[PDB]
Short mmCIF file of N, CA and C and ligand atoms in Angstrom, two decimals:
data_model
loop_
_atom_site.label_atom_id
_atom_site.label_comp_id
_atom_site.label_asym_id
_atom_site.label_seq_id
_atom_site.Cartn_x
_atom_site.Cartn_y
_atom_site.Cartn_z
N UNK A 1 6.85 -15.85 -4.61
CA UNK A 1 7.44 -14.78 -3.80
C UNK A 1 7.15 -13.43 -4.45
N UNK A 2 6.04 -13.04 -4.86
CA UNK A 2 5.36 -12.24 -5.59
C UNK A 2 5.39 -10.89 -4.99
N UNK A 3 4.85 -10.68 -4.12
CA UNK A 3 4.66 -9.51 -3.37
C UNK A 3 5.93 -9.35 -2.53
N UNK A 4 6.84 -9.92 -2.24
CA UNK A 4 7.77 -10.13 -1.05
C UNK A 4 8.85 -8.75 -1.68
N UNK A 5 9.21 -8.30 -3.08
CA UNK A 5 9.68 -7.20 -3.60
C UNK A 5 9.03 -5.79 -3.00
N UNK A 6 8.11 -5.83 -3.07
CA UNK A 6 7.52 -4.46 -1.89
C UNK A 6 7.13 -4.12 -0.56
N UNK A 7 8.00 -5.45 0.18
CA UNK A 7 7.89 -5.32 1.85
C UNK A 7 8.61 -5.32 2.31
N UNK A 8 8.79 -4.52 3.84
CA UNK A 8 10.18 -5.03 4.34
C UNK A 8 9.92 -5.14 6.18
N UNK A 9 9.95 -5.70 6.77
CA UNK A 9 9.74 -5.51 8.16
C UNK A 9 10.71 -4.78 9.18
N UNK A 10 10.10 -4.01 9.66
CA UNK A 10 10.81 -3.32 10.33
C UNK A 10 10.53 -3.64 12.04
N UNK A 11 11.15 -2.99 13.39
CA UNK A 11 10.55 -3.07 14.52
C UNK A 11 9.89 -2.83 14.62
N UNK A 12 8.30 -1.17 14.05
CA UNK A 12 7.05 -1.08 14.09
C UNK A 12 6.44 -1.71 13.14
N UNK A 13 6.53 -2.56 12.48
CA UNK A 13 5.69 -3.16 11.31
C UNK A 13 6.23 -4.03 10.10
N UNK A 14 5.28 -3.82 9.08
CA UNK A 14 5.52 -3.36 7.87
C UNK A 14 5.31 -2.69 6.84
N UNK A 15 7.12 -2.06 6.25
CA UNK A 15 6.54 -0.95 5.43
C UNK A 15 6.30 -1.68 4.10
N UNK A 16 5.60 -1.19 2.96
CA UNK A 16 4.68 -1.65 2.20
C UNK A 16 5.16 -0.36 1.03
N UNK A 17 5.64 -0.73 0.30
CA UNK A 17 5.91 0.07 -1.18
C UNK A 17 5.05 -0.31 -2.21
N UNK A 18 4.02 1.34 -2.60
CA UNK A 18 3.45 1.45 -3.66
C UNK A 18 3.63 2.65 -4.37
N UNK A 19 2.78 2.05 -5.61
CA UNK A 19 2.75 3.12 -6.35
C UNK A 19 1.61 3.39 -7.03
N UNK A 20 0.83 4.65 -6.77
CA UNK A 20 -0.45 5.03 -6.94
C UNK A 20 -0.89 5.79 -8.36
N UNK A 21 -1.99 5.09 -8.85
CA UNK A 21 -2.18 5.97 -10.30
C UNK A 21 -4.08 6.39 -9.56
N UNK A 22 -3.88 7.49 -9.45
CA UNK A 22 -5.48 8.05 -8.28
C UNK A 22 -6.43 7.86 -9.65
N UNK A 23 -7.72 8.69 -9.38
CA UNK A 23 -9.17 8.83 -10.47
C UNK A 23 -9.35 7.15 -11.26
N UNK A 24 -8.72 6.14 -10.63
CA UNK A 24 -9.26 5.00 -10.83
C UNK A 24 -10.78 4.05 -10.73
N UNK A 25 -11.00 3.19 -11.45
CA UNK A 25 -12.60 3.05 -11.45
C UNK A 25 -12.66 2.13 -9.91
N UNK A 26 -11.71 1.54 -9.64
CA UNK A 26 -11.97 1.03 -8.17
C UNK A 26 -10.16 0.75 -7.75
N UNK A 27 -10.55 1.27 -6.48
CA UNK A 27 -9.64 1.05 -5.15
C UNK A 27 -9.05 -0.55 -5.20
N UNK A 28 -7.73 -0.64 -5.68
CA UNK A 28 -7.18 -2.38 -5.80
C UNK A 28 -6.25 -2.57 -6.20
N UNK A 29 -5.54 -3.31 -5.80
CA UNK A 29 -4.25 -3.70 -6.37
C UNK A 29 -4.01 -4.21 -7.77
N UNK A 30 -3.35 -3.81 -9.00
CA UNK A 30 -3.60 -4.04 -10.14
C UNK A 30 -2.08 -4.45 -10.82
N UNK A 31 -1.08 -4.92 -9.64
CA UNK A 31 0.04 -5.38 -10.45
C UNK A 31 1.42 -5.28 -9.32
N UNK A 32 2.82 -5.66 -10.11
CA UNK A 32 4.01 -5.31 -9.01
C UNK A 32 4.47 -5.12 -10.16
N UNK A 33 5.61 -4.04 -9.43
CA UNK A 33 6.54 -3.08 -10.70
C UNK A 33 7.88 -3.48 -10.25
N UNK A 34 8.49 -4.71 -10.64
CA UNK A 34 9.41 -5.80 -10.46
C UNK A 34 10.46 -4.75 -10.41
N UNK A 35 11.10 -3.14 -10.89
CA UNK A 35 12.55 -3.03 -10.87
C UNK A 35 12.23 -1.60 -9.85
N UNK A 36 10.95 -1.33 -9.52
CA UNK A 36 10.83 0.10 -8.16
C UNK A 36 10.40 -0.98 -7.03
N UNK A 37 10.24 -2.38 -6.98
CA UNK A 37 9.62 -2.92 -5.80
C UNK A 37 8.78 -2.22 -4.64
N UNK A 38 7.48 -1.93 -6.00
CA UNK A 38 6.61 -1.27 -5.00
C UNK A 38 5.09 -2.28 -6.15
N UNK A 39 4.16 -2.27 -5.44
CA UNK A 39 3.07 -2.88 -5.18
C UNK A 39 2.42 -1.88 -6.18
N UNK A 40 1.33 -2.44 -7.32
CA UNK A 40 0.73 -0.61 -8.06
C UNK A 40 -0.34 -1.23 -7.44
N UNK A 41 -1.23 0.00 -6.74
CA UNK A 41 -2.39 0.50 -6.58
C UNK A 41 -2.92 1.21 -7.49
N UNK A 42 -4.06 1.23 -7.78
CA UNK A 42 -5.20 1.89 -8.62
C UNK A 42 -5.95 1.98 -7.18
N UNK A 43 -6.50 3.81 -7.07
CA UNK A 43 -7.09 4.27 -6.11
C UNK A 43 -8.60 5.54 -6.80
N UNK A 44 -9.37 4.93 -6.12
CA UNK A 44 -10.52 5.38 -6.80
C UNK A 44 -10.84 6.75 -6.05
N UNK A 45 -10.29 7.95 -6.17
CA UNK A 45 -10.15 8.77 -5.44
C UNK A 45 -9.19 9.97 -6.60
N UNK A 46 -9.67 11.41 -6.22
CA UNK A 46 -8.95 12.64 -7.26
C UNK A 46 -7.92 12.83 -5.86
N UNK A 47 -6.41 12.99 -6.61
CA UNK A 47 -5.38 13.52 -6.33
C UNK A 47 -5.32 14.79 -6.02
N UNK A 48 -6.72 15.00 -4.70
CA UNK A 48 -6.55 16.52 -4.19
C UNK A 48 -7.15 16.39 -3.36
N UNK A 49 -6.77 17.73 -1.84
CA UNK A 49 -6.76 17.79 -0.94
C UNK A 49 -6.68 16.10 0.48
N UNK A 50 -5.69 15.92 -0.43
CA UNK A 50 -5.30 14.48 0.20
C UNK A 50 -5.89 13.13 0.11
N UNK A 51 -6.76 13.29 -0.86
CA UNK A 51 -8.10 12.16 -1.08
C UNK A 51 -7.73 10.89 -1.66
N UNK A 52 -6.52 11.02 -2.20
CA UNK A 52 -6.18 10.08 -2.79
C UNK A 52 -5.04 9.08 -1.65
N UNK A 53 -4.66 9.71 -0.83
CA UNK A 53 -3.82 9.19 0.33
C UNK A 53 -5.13 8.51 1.22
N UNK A 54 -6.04 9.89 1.74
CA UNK A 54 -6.54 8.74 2.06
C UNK A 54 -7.64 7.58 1.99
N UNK A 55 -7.40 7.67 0.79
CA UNK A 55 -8.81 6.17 0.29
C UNK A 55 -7.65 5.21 0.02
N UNK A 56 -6.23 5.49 0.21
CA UNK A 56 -5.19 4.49 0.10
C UNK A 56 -5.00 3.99 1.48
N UNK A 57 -5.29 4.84 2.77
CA UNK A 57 -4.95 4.30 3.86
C UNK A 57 -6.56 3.50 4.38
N UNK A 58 -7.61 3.31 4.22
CA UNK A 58 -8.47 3.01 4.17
C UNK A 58 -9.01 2.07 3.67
N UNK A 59 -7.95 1.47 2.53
CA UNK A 59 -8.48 -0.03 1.74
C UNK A 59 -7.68 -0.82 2.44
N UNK A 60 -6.39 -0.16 2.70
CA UNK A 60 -5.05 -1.25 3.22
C UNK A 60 -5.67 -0.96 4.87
N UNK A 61 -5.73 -0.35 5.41
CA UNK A 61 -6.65 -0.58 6.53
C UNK A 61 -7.58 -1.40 7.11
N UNK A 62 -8.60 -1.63 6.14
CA UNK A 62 -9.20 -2.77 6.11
C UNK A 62 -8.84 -4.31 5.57
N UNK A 63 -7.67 -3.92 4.98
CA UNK A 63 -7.49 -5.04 4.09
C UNK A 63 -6.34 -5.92 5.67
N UNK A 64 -5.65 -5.12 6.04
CA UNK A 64 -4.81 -5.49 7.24
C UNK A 64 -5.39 -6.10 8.31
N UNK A 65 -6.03 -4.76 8.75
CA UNK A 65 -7.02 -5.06 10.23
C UNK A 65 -5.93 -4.20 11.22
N UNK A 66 -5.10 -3.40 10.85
CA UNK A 66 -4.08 -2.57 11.78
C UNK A 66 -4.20 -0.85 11.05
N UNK A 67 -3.55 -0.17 11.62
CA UNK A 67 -3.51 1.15 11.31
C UNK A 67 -2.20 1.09 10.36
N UNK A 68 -2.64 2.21 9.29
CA UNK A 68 -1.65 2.01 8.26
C UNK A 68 -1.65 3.59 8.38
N UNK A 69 -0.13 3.93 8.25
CA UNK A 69 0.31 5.22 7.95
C UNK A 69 1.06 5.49 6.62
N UNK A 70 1.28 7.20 6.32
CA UNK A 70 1.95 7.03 5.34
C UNK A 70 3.56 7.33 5.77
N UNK A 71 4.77 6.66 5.62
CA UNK A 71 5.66 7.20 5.89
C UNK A 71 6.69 8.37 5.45
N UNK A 72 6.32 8.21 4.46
CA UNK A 72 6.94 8.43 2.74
C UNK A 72 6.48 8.69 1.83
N UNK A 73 6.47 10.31 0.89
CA UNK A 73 5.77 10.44 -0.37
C UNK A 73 4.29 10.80 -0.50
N UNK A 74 3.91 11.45 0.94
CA UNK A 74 2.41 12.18 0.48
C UNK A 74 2.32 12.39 -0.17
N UNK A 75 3.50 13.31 -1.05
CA UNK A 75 3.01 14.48 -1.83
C UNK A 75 3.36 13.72 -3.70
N UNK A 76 3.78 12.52 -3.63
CA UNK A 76 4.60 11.57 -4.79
C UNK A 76 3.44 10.35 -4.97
N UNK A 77 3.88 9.73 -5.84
CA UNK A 77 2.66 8.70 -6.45
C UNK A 77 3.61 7.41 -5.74
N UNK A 78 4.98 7.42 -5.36
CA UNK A 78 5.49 6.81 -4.41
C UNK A 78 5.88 6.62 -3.34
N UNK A 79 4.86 5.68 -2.59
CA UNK A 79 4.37 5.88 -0.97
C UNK A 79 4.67 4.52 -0.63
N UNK A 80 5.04 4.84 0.75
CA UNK A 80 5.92 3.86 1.56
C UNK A 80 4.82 3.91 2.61
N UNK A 81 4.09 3.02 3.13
CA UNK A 81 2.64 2.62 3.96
C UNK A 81 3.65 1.91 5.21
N UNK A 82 3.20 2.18 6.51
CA UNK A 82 3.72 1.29 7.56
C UNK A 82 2.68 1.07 8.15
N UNK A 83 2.35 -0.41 8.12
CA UNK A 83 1.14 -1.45 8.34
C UNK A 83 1.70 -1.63 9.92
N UNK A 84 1.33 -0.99 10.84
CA UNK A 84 1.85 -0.90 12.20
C UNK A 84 0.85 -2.24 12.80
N UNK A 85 2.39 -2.88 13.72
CA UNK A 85 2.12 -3.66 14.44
C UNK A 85 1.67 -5.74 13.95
N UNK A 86 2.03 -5.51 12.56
CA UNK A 86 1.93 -6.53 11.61
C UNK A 86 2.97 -7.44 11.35
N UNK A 87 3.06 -8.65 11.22
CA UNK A 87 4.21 -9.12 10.59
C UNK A 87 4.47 -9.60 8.85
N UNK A 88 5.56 -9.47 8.55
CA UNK A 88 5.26 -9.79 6.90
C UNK A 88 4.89 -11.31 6.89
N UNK A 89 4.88 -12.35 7.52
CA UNK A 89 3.96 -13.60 7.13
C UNK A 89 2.47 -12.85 6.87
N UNK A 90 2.21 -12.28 7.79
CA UNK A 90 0.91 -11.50 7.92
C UNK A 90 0.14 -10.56 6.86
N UNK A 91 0.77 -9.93 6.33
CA UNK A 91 0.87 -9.03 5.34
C UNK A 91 0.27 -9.82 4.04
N UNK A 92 2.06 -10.72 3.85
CA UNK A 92 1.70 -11.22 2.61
C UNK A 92 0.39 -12.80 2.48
N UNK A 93 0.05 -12.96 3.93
CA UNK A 93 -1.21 -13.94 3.39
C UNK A 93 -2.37 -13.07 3.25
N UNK A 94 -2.36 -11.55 3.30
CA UNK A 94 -3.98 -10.65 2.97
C UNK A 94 -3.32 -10.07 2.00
N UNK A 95 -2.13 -9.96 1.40
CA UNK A 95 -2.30 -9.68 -0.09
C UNK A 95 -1.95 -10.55 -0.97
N UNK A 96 -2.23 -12.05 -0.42
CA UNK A 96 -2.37 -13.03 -1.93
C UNK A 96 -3.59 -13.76 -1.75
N UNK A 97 -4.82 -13.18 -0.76
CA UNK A 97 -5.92 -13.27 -0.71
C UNK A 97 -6.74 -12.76 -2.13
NA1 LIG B 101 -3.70 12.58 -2.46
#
């Protein structure tokens, strides 16, 4: 029940808690931060003019197959993603892929 600490389903989706460390050597999930229950991302992207948001909405994008927004925390390294139109069975079998 690994990942199940940084999801939560809502009526549009699911939202998806991370936490981003940007100028990474590649775009990927690199751990869970068991007491913020958020998901860490490493994002291969500089923390300016939004670049780092969005090469975050763009991996989980593809990684989903749905449109991912940010809900929460543009401007914070803690971002709340709503994987629109998804269910968390759904979710969590493409992130223990
Ligand atoms: Na950014």
């Amino acid at each position: 029940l690994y990942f199940q600490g940084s999801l939560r389903e809502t009526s549009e989706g699911v939202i998806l808690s991370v936490i981003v460390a940007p100028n990474a050597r590649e775009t990927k999930i690199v751990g869970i931060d068991g007491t913020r229950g958020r998901v860490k991302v490493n994002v291969a992207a500089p923390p300016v003019k939004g670049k780092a948001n969005k090469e975050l909405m763009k991996f989980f994008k593809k990684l989903f197959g749905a449109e991912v927004v940010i809900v929460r925390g543009e401007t914070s390294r803690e971002k709340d993603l709503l994987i629109k139109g998804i269910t968390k069975k759904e979710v969590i079998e493409k992130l223990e892929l």
